[PDB]
Amino acid sequence: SGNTGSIINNYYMQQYQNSMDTQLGDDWFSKLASSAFSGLFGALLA
Amino acid sequence: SGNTGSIINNYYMQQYQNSMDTQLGDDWFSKLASSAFSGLFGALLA
Amino acid sequence: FTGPTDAKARYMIAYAPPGMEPPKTPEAAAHCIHAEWDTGLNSKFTFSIPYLSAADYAYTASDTAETTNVQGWVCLFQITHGKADGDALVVLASAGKDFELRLPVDART
Amino acid sequence: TTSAGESADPVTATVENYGGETQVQRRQHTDVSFILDRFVKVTPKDQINVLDLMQTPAHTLVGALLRTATYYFADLEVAVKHEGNLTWVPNGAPETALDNTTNPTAYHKAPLTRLALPYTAPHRVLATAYNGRTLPTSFNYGAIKATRVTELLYRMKRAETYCPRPLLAIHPSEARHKQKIVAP
Amino acid sequence: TTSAGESADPVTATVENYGGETQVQRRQHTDVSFILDRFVKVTPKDQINVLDLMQTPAHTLVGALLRTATYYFADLEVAVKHEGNLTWVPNGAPETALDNTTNPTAYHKAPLTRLALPYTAPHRVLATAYNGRTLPTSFNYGAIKATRVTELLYRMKRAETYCPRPLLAIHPSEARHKQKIVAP
Amino acid sequence: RILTTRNGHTTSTTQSSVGVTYGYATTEDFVSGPNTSGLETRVVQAERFFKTHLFDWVTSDSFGRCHLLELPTDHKGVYGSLTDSYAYMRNGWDVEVTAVGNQFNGGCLLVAMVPELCSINKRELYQLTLFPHQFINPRTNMTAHITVPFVGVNRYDQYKVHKPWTLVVMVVAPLTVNTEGAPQIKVYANIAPTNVHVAGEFPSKE
Amino acid sequence: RILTTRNGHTTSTTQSSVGVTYGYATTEDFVSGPNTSGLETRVVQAERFFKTHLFDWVTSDSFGRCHLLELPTDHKGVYGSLTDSYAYMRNGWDVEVTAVGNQFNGGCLLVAMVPELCSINKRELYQLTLFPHQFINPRTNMTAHITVPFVGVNRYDQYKVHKPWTLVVMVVAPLTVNTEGAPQIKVYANIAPTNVHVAGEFPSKE
Structure with missing residues (x-):
């Protein structure tokens, strides 16, 4: 996902190559940047 | 495309092996050579 | 703008491209890409400095053999003001929608 | 673009305001996972080395960028130059375990040993700052030991970052910070 | 075949004009990408070497053919013999970066290091001549550094060439340039 | 009351706008007539704001004190070079006049665009x-905005010998400072030529 | 073989044309790229013929004698002022070279447009x-016509520091007069900038 560029599947199982994430029950900054006001606050002439 | 002769796909992704080209919006000399006049300008006898 | 309600002013921001010395007066800078605005209910004004260059990318670092700035100058002027002596105009910078950085490098710093 | 500056809602003006045109941008190089996913050298201790990302020098690319996150998560890779066999031990292990070979031990093989290690801390995430200067001792990725370690490099895998913090460039004495740039 | 010589429109007469027959031709060996896609040796400097295709000697096959293009594009491969670790840095990098290991660094491995590098200049294309003798410093493929570099070879990949320029053979003093040709 | 005006790659924003006064017309008359034989062209690059100081409004100025600015005026940008490269021209004007003091000043200015102004009594x-015209009354606004088209007995003009428009600013009620107002108000103009057309290219000086 | 070329309000007619040579391309590449952020504009008023003397072709000139003219060159018209008003520019060239003697002269000239010409051996x-390129052979013609697009490592240029094109005229066969030919032939150039685009307006000198 980061700086990896092999087209073949890793020889070892995922369970060994990395730690495994568990669940309970750019996210925030991406939403913040996307919500930015990008116009003019007033009336526009020509 | 040039002096490459492997029949197997490169182990690494194209995105890593080479730089990636982008688009905006032997070409010229091939057309020039192909358009060359190749006959006789006058009348031909026997 | 940070001055009190009875302090008014009119400002001008301009972008002077490389190849000629930057403007020293608002009149000379008028011929550059620029914006003028005054104070009021809304205290903030945002202006986009355009990317203008011969090449598609510019260097982030500045070379030591580079005496005159390669990418130009930003010029902030005061057109005039009404009783705004000593009042502060704070300025910030952020990346625009198409700002892009490429080619990672570790140079110390 | 005028707006209420006291607000904090982000405002992003564009060149369209004066007739320009916003272009396309490709930001793969500023992607968090991508940029942190590379080796960074650390100065090691002769034998026992606790794996701790805060050992990265603060001015390096990896060190600086890691410090712009207050909380982070990542698996790890290390490349080590060492004499004798290299033994790794997980977070929470007694130091004495560093001498027992049943714990992951890599037998010497020139010129160095590269290993993939899992996150092993008891916390859901780690931090680069902790208001409790000094970080809790449980903030580590275990420890390694060898007769002598000569080089140690860290590499963050699958990195995640939360809550940005200041990132400072060099402060110039002149109008611009000038450096000799590579040129023919 | 007679024609207006002042015109410049290409004219290609054939042997058919006098009863001959034009044959089949295979021109793979004069294909641009193919012919430039091979290693060429350059004399290196002890430590810092800016990667610059114009370092190729002008009389070599690669050097001569590259110079027949005024503008060109290509990715690159290098093969380097060096002591210590080899560090590469992209176009526009401060020279000081050559000493930091997080920039692509290859650890020594006999007998040499072969690396594939991407085009990295800020220009859409580079040039072998620039009317501004001397070329802009931004015309390069980054730089490399090692304790000592003994051999440096360049190899152009995916090459593209624009606007042909003069390509000169040796000028003979006699009626023909004679050379000893390999023979049993 | 925020108004942003754009002329080319230049913008001007005001938060104390009273609107814009359109003089004599909303649109320009025909730009292609028989006097230029179809040889005229538009020069968009000149349609942008240029600036100039007018005068300093002080408490000693009384009713009738005025300042005149004939248009076109000296221009050191592309519009100015046009007058040296072409024999005939025409354009309207987008005029913005500013007088910034504060809301504690009193008094009043009248700004007007007057055609063929050979002095006024x-x-x-x-x-x-x-x-x-439009007024500048400190209790209400600091900006006056007027937009006018090209006028004249001729469809195209020779600006070296004729100035069709004159910008005039006049004091109608004297300036008052009253302890909290600005001590004086400098008056500035931000002007942009509109719909500029030229005809009859001149030779160079070589 | 009559050819009339028009560039703006200027025309050039020749009755001894050998046609026109299009160099490297028939059309220009994209004029709006990311390096100008959509701020570029076209200036049609500059796309017209300007003139200049090159050299006098005499009988003593031998093979290889050449004359170089870097483009853009000094221009005292609108195109020239553009280089003082804008930081970035691009344009192609429509080039017409003339060498008038008569049909009793002999000899031959080669005229070519060469990119990035830092002297030639x-x-x-x-x-x-x-x-x-195109040849000028007195027995056949007196005019050479070449048309080329903008070229360069950059989509836009800074002409104060870089000249992408160089016009070159070279003697390939020496001039002969033979009793009835013209005693010498003066060589002139009639050039027009094509598709001129500018970006990045400079401040004035005021």
Whole structure:
């Protein structure tokens, strides 16, 4: 996902190559940047 | 495309092996050579 | 703008491209890409400095053999003001929608 | 673009305001996972080395960028130059375990040993700052030991970052910070 | 075949004009990408070497053919013999970066290091001549550094060439340039 | 009351706008007539704001004190070079006049665009409102905005010998400072030529 | 063989045309790229013929004698002022070279447009035909016409520091007068900038 560029599947199982994430029950900054006001606050002439 | 002769796909992704080209919006000399006049300008006898 | 309600002013921001010395007066800078605005209910004004260059990318670092700035100058002027002596105009910078950085490098710093 | 500056809602003006045109941008190089996913050298201790990302020098690319996150998560890779066999031990292990070979031990093989290690801390995430200067001792990725370690490099895998913090460039004495740039 | 010589429109007469027959031709060996896609040796400097295709000697096959293009594009491969670790840095990098290991660094491995590098200049294309003798410093493929570099070879990949320029053979003093040709 | 005006790659924003006064017309008359034989062209690059100081409004100025600015005026940008490269021209004007003090100043200015102004007499100032205009009253605004088209007996002009428009600013009620107002108000103009067309290219000086 | 070329309000007619050579391309590449952020504009008023004397072709000139003219060159018209008003520019060239003697002169000239020409050596002149070109052979014609697009490592240029094109005229066969030919032939150039685009307006000198 980061700086990896092999087209073949890793020889070892995922369970060994990395730690495994568990669940309970750019996210925030991406939403913040996307919500930015990008116009003019007033009336526009020509 | 040039002096490459492997029949197997490169182990690494194209995105890593080479730089990636982008688009905006032997070409010229091939057309020039192909358009060359190749006959006789006058009348031909026997 | 940070001055009190009875302090008014009119400002001008301009972008002077490389190849000629930057403007020293608002009149000379008028011929550059620029914006003028005054104070009021809304205290903030945002202006986009355009990317203008011969090449598609510019260097982030500045070379030591580079005496005159390669990418130009930003010029902030005061057109005039009404009783705004000593009042502060704070300025910030952020990346625009198409700002892009490429080619990672570790140079110390 | 005028707006209420006291607000904090982000405002992003564009060149369209004066007739320009916003272009396309490709930001793969500023992607968090991508940029942190590379080796960074650390100065090691002769034998026992606790794996701790805060050992990265603060001015390096990896060190600086890691410090712009207050909380982070990542698996790890290390490349080590060492004499004798290299033994790794997980977070929470007694130091004495560093001498027992049943714990992951890599037998010497020139010129160095590269290993993939899992996150092993008891916390859901780690931090680069902790208001409790000094970080809790449980903030580590275990420890390694060898007769002598000569080089140690860290590499963050699958990195995640939360809550940005200041990132400072060099402060110039002149109008611009000038450096000799590579040129023919 | 007679024609207006002042015109410049290409004219290609054939042997058919006098009863001959034009044959089949295979021109793979004069294909641009193919012919430039091979290693060429350059004399290196002890430590810092800016990667610059114009370092190729002008009389070599690669050097001569590259110079027949005024503008060109290509990715690159290098093969380097060096002591210590080899560090590469992209176009526009401060020279000081050559000493930091997080920039692509290859650890020594006999007998040499072969690396594939991407085009990295800020220009859409580079040039072998620039009317501004001397070329802009931004015309390069980054730089490399090692304790000592003994051999440096360049190899152009995916090459593209624009606007042909003069390509000169040796000028003979006699009626023909004679050379000893390999023979049993 | 925020108004942003754009002319080319230049913008001007005001938060104390009273609107814009359109003088004599909303649109320009025909730009291609028989006097240029179809040889005229538009020069968009000149349609942008240029600036100039007018005068300093002080408490000692009394009713009738005025300042005149004939247009076109000296221009050191592309519009100015046009007058040296072409024999005939025409354009309208987008005019913005500013007088910034604060809301504690009193008094009043009248700004007007007057055609063919060969000096005006004292009694005639009482009727300056017959011309495209707008007032600058500190308690309300700091900006006046007027937009006018090209006018004249001829479809195209020779600016070296004729100035069709004159910008005039007049004091109608004297400036008051009253302890909290600005001590004086400098008056500035931000002007942009509109719909500029040229015809008849001149030779160079070589 | 009559050819009339028009560039703006200027025309050039020849009755001894050998046609026009299009160099490297028939059309220009994209004029709006990311390096100008959509701020570029076209200036049609500059796309017209300007003139200049090159050299006098005399009988004593031998093979290889050449004359170089870097483009853009000094221009005292609108195109020239553009280089003082804008930081970035691009344009192609429509070039017409003339060498008028009569049909009783002999000899031959080669005229070519060469990109990035940092001086050329003697042996390389033998291969000048690799570049867009046309010959001037008195028995046949008095005019050479070449048209080339903008070229360069950058989509836009800074002409104060870089000249992408160089016009070159070279003697390939020496001039002969033979009793009835013209005693000498003056060579002139009639050039027009094509598709001129500018970006990045400079401040004035005020």
